[PDB]
Amino acid sequence: ASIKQLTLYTAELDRMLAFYTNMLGAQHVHEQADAFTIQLGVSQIQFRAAADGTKPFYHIAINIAANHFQEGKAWLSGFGELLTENDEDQAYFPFFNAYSCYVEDPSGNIIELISRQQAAPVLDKPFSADQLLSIGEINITTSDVEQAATRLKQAELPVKLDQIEPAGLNFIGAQDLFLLLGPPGRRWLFSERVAVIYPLQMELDNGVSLAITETGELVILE
Numbered sequence: 769a770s771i772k773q774l775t776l777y778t779a780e781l782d783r784m785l786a787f788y789t790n791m792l793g794a795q796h797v798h799e800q801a802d803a804f805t806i807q808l809g810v811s812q813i814q815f816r817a818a819a820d821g822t823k824p825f826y827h828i829a830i831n832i833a834a835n836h837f838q839e840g841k842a843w844l845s846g847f848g849e850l851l852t853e854n855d856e857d858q859a860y861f862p863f864f865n866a867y868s869c870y871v872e873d874p875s876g877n878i879i880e881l882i883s884r885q886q887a888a889p890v891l892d893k894p895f896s897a898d899q900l901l902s903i904g905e906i907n908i909t910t911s912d913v914e915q916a917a918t919r920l921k922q923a924e925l926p927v928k929l930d931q932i933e934p935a936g937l938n939f940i941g942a943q944d945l946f947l948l949l950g951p952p953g954r955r956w957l958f959s960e961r962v963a964v965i966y967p968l969q970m971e972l973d974n975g976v977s978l979a980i981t982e983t984g985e986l987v988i989l990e
């Protein structure tokens with residue numbers, strides 16, 4: 769399964785627009801009324817203006833070819849200081865057998881480039897903005913982890929209920945797509961920001977559609 773559409777909010781719509789227009793190219797970013805969309809391979813993200821008094825941010829990982837990590841890292845570093853953790857500007861996660869690259873955007877989103885060494889294809893050609901494959905990860909920060917895992921399982925997603933941990937982060941998915949299901953509070957790696965509940969909507973490849981309210985409740989829309 770893949771993310772076809774992702775709806776996120778932002779308190780820096782104008783700055784966000786310029787940032788991504790400069791990063792992805794005018795041919796991948798469409799400005800709309802009080803919102804704009806960006807194209808990331810087979811995935812699309814619409815950023816909508818956030819409600820006053822709030823400054824939403826999320827953790828978004830973008831898939832890139834197994835052999836494009838170094839190039840992706842260099843490309844990403846041209847748009848912002850690369851984030852570090854343990855004084856390292858990149859990380860290797862053995863569970864996903866992937867290398868990841870991080871940068872913060874104007875609204876404080878943790879933008880990540882993830883290169884899956886075996887779960888992503890090898891593209892014998894130069895990396896470029898046009899080479900972003902799709903959304904590989906998105907955080908589902910909920911006020912009730914067990915309830916979300918349940919409804920997600922009901923939505924027919926790969927879920928091991930007896931393995932879900934309410935107080936921690938839980939990887940839900942397979943192949944090149946994982947939902948980072950967890951509670952608010954914990955600091956995000958490569959970031960000063962701690963997990964906080966913010967609304968969002970998501971439409972998957974299989975027609976499944978779900979949203980997270982401002983309360984943090986996960987609810988299957990479709």
Ligand SMILES: Cn1ncnc2c(=O)n(C)c(=O)nc1-2
Binds near residue numbers: 878937955958
């Ligand atoms: C546990 N874990 N595994 C993989 N990737 C991450 C990650 O990107 N971030 C931001 C995070 O807080 N935790 C992670």
Ligand SMILES: [Mn+2]
Binds near residue numbers: 827829905
């Ligand atoms: Mn990640």
